[PDB]
């Protein structure tokens with residue numbers, strides 16, 4: 001003939017159907033790991049407000065409305081909130097939409113009701129915000145969604161504009177781009193092998209998770225799902241039509257139709273797509289003119305290349321330690337972190353506004369800052385700020401900046417003393433006179449009080465000593481207990497052993513830590529003496545639902561509860577009438593426990609603040625170690641009081657442990673069985689400590 005040619009293109013035909021088998025049956029992409037924040041459970045009589053609740057919802061992608069029609073929305077009432085808790089695939093159970101009314105009375109959430117059965121919820125799951133994605137070596141970022149996850153609507157917006165789909169599809173996942181006619185043939189040929197072997201229903205599952213729709217550095221953003229988030233901040237399913245249009249309009253043009261870069265060309269493309277469905281039955285003139293009028297593109301406005309960079313450092317670090325290298329191999333990995341968006345916003349805000357207000361107020365060139373927030377009892381890390389400009393960064397001062405803590409070291413000592421309830425109490429009289437301290441060579445160490453003065457009487461109760469952050473008595477104290485012990489306390493609060501150089505000055509701050517290390521130390525005390533090893537990770541779950549890693553309470557008794565109690569109580573004095581008295585004046589009803597830090601020549605300032613739920617380490621200083629001109633620890637307090645004012649802190653109600661009892665002491669500081677001018681908590685099962693003190697006579 002020769003019709004031999006037709007024998008070859010057919011046997012060629014079955015070779016491309018044997019290639020599409022290996023491709024689509026199973027592994028279509030190496031899907032990068034998804035990173036989600038904390039999964040919060042709301043509960044009857046939970047200690048949360050309606051206002052708080054708004055912020056929380058709003059921080060986890062929910063949108064206030066007047067009347068509510070799609071998932072991820074909420075409407076506020078005078079004592080209640082109605083909301084549609086979005087479908088989410090929780091490790092504990094997959095779940096769907098749920099319409100629920102949260103009802104409030106005071107500080108507590110009273111009930112939580114399903115609005116289809118008017119039945120209560122014992123507990124109610126709130127889906128975690130998607131924080132970020134990690135890249136694939138490949139450098140293509142998608143987010144797999146079932147075809148049924150896309151509204152049938154968006155599909156029709158897709159179709160009405162683009163269907164030659166099974167045609168497009170193949171090229172992207174299979175062939176090069178615009179290399180020859182030679183390939184378009186391949187395409188048309190494959191394009192009917194596909195539409196033959198795999199159903200229409202499945203095709204646009206594979207399509208809508210392949211389409212290149214945006215850019216973030218050197219990784220291509222592909223997939224309707226992920227684009228929705230990227231550009232707007234909501235799942236494709238919750239996309240309004242103006243947004244879906246932008247998406248569907250962008251399928252052709254992925255950079256020239258980019259909104260960030262060119263509004264005109266982006267808007268001009270969308271308003272075209274808004275009229276591409278007007279010929280179509282779906283759109284009625286009344287709608288079209290309105291949608292086009294509604295400026296479709298929701299601008300943060302940011303590129304959002306590397307989100308939560310500081311926090312992620314830790315996460316990435318924690319993936320490595322608990323799962324080695326063989327995470328990257330795996331596809332469709334779901335990683336659940338301890339991250340807290342409300343705490344984070346509050347943190348980032350508090351930096352961004354705090355720092356310039358402290359340069360301006362004090363007239364500075366540079367002033368950097370770091371904030372680390374972790375669960376009082378769990379150690380779970382809820383927020384982390386590495387610098388004054390925390391959105392965009394490569395240096396994380398929460399984790400890398402190792403700066404002497406100065407004062408941030410005083411309670412190690414007191415807790416050490418206060419662990420001995422037979423000998424040291426809060427009313428124990430420490431000496432407040434001039435010290436001199438020969439070392440091997442050459443000097444004689446002679447630490448002065450902050451004010452360079454000394455207590456008229458020659459002494460000070462231990463309770464006031466710490467409250468005031470008085471140095472002299474603190475060295476007198478430590479040098480009586482001995483540096484090895486003060487060092488043992490540091491080891492047990494969980495500070496990096498290599499860091500402790502047990503020499504007198506450590507007592508006052510010769511100790512360099514990173515905010516996160518200090519976060520650990522003060523956690524251990526905040527929890528009443530259980531050290532809980534900090535972490536970012538709640539779990540790591542595979543695509544086939546399968547647990548690769550799960551965290552579990554690994555907390556450890558580090559110091560006596562009574563000792564932590566007493567020490568913590570004292571740090572409530574620190575904030576109420578001592579070194580942090582300025583916060584205590586602002587938030588008296590918090591009864592915050594905390595402690596101030598100041599290095600010499602004001603290079604570093606700390607504040608360390610415990611409320612009923614968190615511990616918040618706040619550091620402020622200069623990268624170049626120069627003086628900060630910031631008199632006192634206030635500098636970093638001014639950030640902390642910013643932070644507290646951004647979120648809704650939990651007031652600190654210390655529950656005294658066993659063998660605590662409030663006793664009276666006289667002006668001379670000896671206990672009294674009735675009366676006394678000053679009531680102090682004491683570690684005794686039997687408080688006749690006082691009788692035996694009263695026999696002084």
Ligand SMILES: *C(=O)N1C[C@H](NOS(=O)(=O)O)CC[C@H]1C(=O)NO[C@H]1CCNC1
Nearest residue numbers: 406407469509579596597598599600633
């Ligand atoms: C606290 O940092 N202190 C105690 C004194 N008052 O500060 S306070 O507001 O925090 O109560 C003053 C000195 C300071 C301290 O110990 N500073 O020395 C540091 C400098 C570097 N090595 C130790």
